[PDB]
Structure 1
Amino acid sequence: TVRIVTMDAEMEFNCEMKWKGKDLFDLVCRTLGLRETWFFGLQYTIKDTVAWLKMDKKVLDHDVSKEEPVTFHFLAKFYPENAEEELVQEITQHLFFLQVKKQILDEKIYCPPEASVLLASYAVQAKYGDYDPSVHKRGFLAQEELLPKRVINLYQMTPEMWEERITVWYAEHRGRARDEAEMEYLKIAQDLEMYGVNYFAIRNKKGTELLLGVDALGLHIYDPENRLTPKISFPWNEIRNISYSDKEFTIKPLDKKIDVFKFNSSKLRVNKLILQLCIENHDLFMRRRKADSLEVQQMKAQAREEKARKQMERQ
């Protein structure tokens, strides 16, 4: 018995014994009606280690616990550069909105205080629809989790004062349907420095502890105390080659004036994950810079028909 946890739902599947990661993943995506499968994965945690279900491996053969309800979390593994230009289906847009809002509220990704207020105002518009002073009276947001605790702890303001500031901006969002408000939330969130960045502990050749960030834009090297501003960045289209051999990675820039960057990473399983994230992020970087495939063109036409079908019922 396999339990699948999405950002807003829990499903149970009667998984076959001789089934591989691909079979379970495809079933989940079909059940959800999700066609942009390339962004997503099935994640699990064992003995303090985050891992993804391998598509070419048997589900039961994985290092996951042999607990009665074998559980995976369906989550986005890859992120678009501009969600407003790339995410086609409403289901995909909504799952990204939920996941990213959770990363902001639980402080997985940093957010300046002013952005947390503006983001909360779009989350309120998405959840409640248009602000209406007859309905949304003072105290209507008292039970909502609106801001990261880090932000609340930086100011001498009451919950009512935070609600008032959020409500001012919520009132400015009149006219945004749920999908429009959730997409405006993603448009703000996707410009945060930590958005979509996968961090890994590495060392340079002199032993200096650093972090590698793998993201939709390229590769980035950080001092461990500052995950916001890379010391050096290598955009995907500026990398000539990435080599890996015996725990050592080498990033070779296309620009000869930029030095080759070598670093080490201690865990083989993590190194395989770093390489997988490099290959697929580089592939997605190239794909979004070329004209839509016929499959994407048709997916957009179908999403347009679905949006117009739902709009006819409301009007």
Structure 2
Amino acid sequence: PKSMQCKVILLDGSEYTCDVEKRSRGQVLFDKVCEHLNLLEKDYFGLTYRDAENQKNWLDPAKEIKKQVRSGAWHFSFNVKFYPPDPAQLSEDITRYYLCLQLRDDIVSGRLPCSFVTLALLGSYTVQSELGDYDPDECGSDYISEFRFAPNHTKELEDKVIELHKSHRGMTPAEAEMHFLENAKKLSMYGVDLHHAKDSEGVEIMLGVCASGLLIYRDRLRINRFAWPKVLKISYKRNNFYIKIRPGEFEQFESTIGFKLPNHRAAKRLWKVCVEHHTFFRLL
């Protein structure tokens, strides 16, 4: 039985290596990673890989790994797939812990924009969780933390993290992680997966997929929001993605909004993440 080596980047930035039979479905690898991580609440997570176009794709647990990675290396990342709207309702601390690690990367990467004060508050909870109570021995007026807190670090941000860290004396890692999540979950881009698209008039927009529904960012003056209930059906054809929207009660007919994606694979990728989000958040 011939086995392929798999390399998985974990949320702490470490590499897990294992082997699976070469015809294995994604679920086989995912189960091995989750066992390694002592993760039971697996439903919120998945593995990503990079395609021949270098785009992030979700490894489908139901399909053979080889028919997805195709010509590419068997190299993956472990990621949050479905961001829980209320992390306090997760049953395990270790689940909240992996969600915190994901969000810290979302923030440092700039996928999850954040005000100065929220960057410093989130940072202060991370330090409390990672190091425990504030110690002036480690920290002088010139302190810079090893922790990455933001897409651009300043001395003022490092100072504010320490100031808030001082206020958290006696907080346990689980408690600090829960506070981190209570703040992160409120950010306007929390758990929003963004896709580049053009509207029916060729104007560049972003589509966001999240728990509550589909967002159309036409600009900061005009964001349209379609709660999952308002979304009749989803479809792709060629480079196009279509959303059918319920009529207002007493209008007779649904509306169709069409979008032009960069290529056929980007349209199919958007369709599949929408279907998965609608199913997941239909059942939550």
TM-score higher than 0.5: yes
- Measure, in 1, the Cα distance between the counterparts of 2:247 and 2:175: 39
Alpha-carbon distance change, 174 to 64 in structure 1, aligned in 2, over 3 angstroms: farther
Q: Let me know the Cα RMSD of the aligned residues.
A: 2.6
Q: Which moved more, 1:51-60 or 1:143-152?
A: 143-152
1:148-163 correspondence to structure 2 within 5 Å: 148-150=150-152, 152=154, 159=155, 161-163=156-158
Contact in 1 for aligned 2:199/2:260 (Cα 8 Å): no
Distance change in 2, residues 1:162/1:203 (3 Å): closer
**C-alpha deviations, 1:235-288, integer Å up to 9, x for none?**
123334435455240231363479835122333322232222222222332333
CA distance in 2, matches of 1:147, 1:55: 32
Q: Secondary structure at the match of 1:167?
A: helix
Conservation of the 8 A alpha-carbon contact between 1:202 and 1:265 = yes
Query: Does 1:192 find its partner at 2:187?
Result: yes
Query: What residue is the counterpart of 2:140 in the other structure?
Result: 138
- TM-score where L is the length of structure 1: 0.77
The count of aligned residue pairs is: 274
CA contact (8 A) 1:201 1:212 kept: yes
* Structure 1 residue 213: Cα displacement: 0.8
Aligned to 2:37: 32
Aligned CA distance change for structure 1 residues 142 and 244 (closer, same or farther; 3 Å):
closer
Is 1:252 the counterpart of 2:245 in the alignment?
Answer: yes
Code of the residue aligned with 2:18 in structure 1: it is F
Q: 1:59 aligns with which of 54, 65, 88?
A: 65
Deviation track 1:103-138 (CA, whole Å, cap 9, x = no partner) reads 1122122111121111111111111112244x4442
Cα offset, 1:42, TM superposition = 1.1
What corresponds to 1:311 in structure 2?
Answer: none
Please give the residue correspondences for 1:93-132 in structure 2 after superposition, counting only pairs within 5 Å.
93-132=96-135
> Any conservation in 1 of the 2:236–2:268 contact (CA below 8 Å)?
no
The answer to whether residue 8 in structure 2 is matched with residue 4 in structure 1 is yes
Judged with a 3 Å threshold, the aligned counterparts in structure 2 of structure 1 residues 15 and 140 are, in CA distance, closer, same or farther, namely: farther
Following the alignment from structure 1 to structure 2, what is the Cα–Cα distance between the partners of residues 61 and 213? Answer: 27
Unpaired runs of at least 5, structure 1: 153-158, 289-315
Task: State the partner residue of 1:201.
Answer: 196
Post-superposition offset of 1:208: 2.1
Number of the residue aligned with 1:278: 274
Per-residue deviation at 1:145? 3.5
Whether 2:70 is the aligned partner of 1:78: answer: no
How much does 1:182 deviate? Answer: 1.4
**How far apart are the structure 2 equivalents of 1:40 and 1:251?**
28
What amino acid maps onto 2:66 in structure 1? L
Distance 2:149 2:222 in 1: 26
- Residue range with higher mean Cα deviation, 210-219 or 4-13: 4-13
Amino-acid identity (%): 30
> Normalising by the residue count of structure 2, what TM-score does the alignment of the two structures yield?
0.85
Higher strand share: 2
Task: Report deviation, 1:72.
Answer: 0.7
Q: In structure 1, how many angstroms separate the alpha carbons of the residues matched to 2:128 and 2:157?
A: 16
Report what 2:25 is aligned to: 20
- Assess if the C-alpha contact under 8 Å between 1:240 and 1:254 holds in 2: no
In 2, Cα distance between equivalents of 1:254 and 1:150:
45
Name stretches of at least 5 consecutive residues in structure 2 with no aligned partner. Answer: none
Task: Output the CA distance in 1 between the equivalents of 2:244 and 2:231.
Answer: 7
Q: Which amino acid aligns with 1:165?
A: K
Which residue in 1 is equivalent to 2:224? 232
* Distance apart, 1:66 and its partner CA: 4.8
Q: Read off the aligned partner of 1:232 and give its amino acid letter.
A: N
Q: 1:94 to 1:249 in 2, by over 3 A?
A: same
